[PDB]
Amino acid sequence: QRDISFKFMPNYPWEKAKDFLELENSLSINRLSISWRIMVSNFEPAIFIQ
Amino acid sequence: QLLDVSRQIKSYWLTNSLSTSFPTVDYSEPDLEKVKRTLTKLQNHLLEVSLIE
Amino acid sequence: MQELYLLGVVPSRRFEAVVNSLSKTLDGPKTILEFWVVYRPKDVPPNLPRQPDSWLRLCSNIESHDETDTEWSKNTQWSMYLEGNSEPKREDKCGIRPVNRAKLTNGSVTEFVEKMGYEFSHEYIIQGLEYFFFDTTVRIYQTLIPSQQRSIKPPFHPMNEEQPWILHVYTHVADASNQVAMAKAEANLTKVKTLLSAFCDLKNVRL
Amino acid sequence: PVHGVIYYSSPSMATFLSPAQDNLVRTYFAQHLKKWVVQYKLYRNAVTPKTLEFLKQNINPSMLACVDEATMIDAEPELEDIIVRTKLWNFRQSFTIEGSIYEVGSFKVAIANVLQKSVWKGILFHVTYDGTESVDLARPIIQEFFLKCFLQNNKSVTPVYESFFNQPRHSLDSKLLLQLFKQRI
Q: What does the sequence similarity comment in the record state about its family (chain C)?
């Protein structure tokens, strides 16, 4: 809406599952981290938040 | 009375917990990589994604 | 910490039946492979130490290292058990054994114990399965002597030819004094014992 | 990052902690995080082998415990009970440190009293400075801030302490703390 550059970059646990029981434990997970990067302006250094 | 006894014996034999198996009718294949991809696809609906870093 | 225990014996052919059939009774089997070594106080002052029983033993989980390579006592996590003799006058009821334990990391466990002044006594392996009931475990194991000190995986030397298996029932109460918690652990042990007794007979013994 | 450990033994420093904290919060807008306590215990079996154990409360989960002076392992509190039950090791000797950690602008500090059985009131400080990790630049920023924030008595007394250094953890090594107790007896 306000035309700000950004990159999403999510890393879901179920991507990493070797087999199905792994997939189970993946869904059951208690917490996950999703790292964002946000460029406010071209000259301004990027500000990133997880 | 003999028939009662023989029945009891059959039942006992069948009561014994020696099955040690399951019926197992399997043979429909997981195709996990498809489930991963459909999961991600749904989870990122309407979302612009970027590369890892 | 107080542990309430029952135990029994299982011959070899009777082992396999007791196993599958245990899987039918209560919560499925967890593979357990343990390496144990004991230590002995070198000072032996005869009046008060009472070193024959109170001396300590310590062990650790070897889930998968020895099959892959030469066993690494440095690599695995270690824990130390002080288990005392069992309480007598308990012929009728379940047994009581006081046990205390601590987990040890970032150190030479061997060098630490011997620097205490303890010193090697015996070294044995525990191999078997354990099953679960609510707040009460049950492991069937066998006592495999190692081929060598810190023996590799291929050998697994067994103690006797008959190779009998041993049945241990686990229950833990933190607080010795609480009669209500002893009561509930007692009844949990009674109920599990009843079911397990249908399975096979087992009873309280000393230590 | 880079943190300094300072320590005082003057009796003025004795009375100092509570008003020091209070003034810190009030005047410099400190925020109070977890209270700090650590416990040191020292005894030795009938054959004269020293053993000592001490317990940071922050990371109590790992209790660090060493035989004589030489040899140490990380272990559980129940281990200590083990050694008591064996009775081969003799009776305790206890030091303790109690204070509380504050976060003030760009660094976090620990203000604590050291004492045995509430004997005395010699004060320990511990300032982790978020920033440069160059010991030579942090040492005078830390020193400057410490002076500024505790300057009333600052003319009046001088410390004995361990120099500041750079270490990744946000809390100071437990082994080092043992070394502080052992140089302190």
A: Belongs to the Mediator complex subunit 18 family.
Closest approach of chain C CAs to the CA of D139, in angstroms? 31
Tell me the CATH number at C145. 2.40.320.10
List the single best residue of C24, C26, C195, C200 to mutate versus B (max B Cβ within 10 A).
C24
Number of folded domains that form chain C: 1
Beta-bridged to residue A48, according to DSSP, are A37
Query: Which of C115, C119, C172, C175 would best serve as a mutation to test chain D binding (most D beta carbons within 10 A)?
Result: C115
Domain that holds residue C29: 1-207
- The experimental resolution of this structure, in angstroms, equals 3.4
Q: Which of D165, D107, D159 is nearest to D134 (CA)?
A: D165
The technique is X-ray
Q: Does A39 touch chain B (CB under 8 A)?
A: no
Q: Tokens 């917990």 sit at which residue?
A: B17
Nearest-CB residue to B52 (from A11, A17, A20): A11
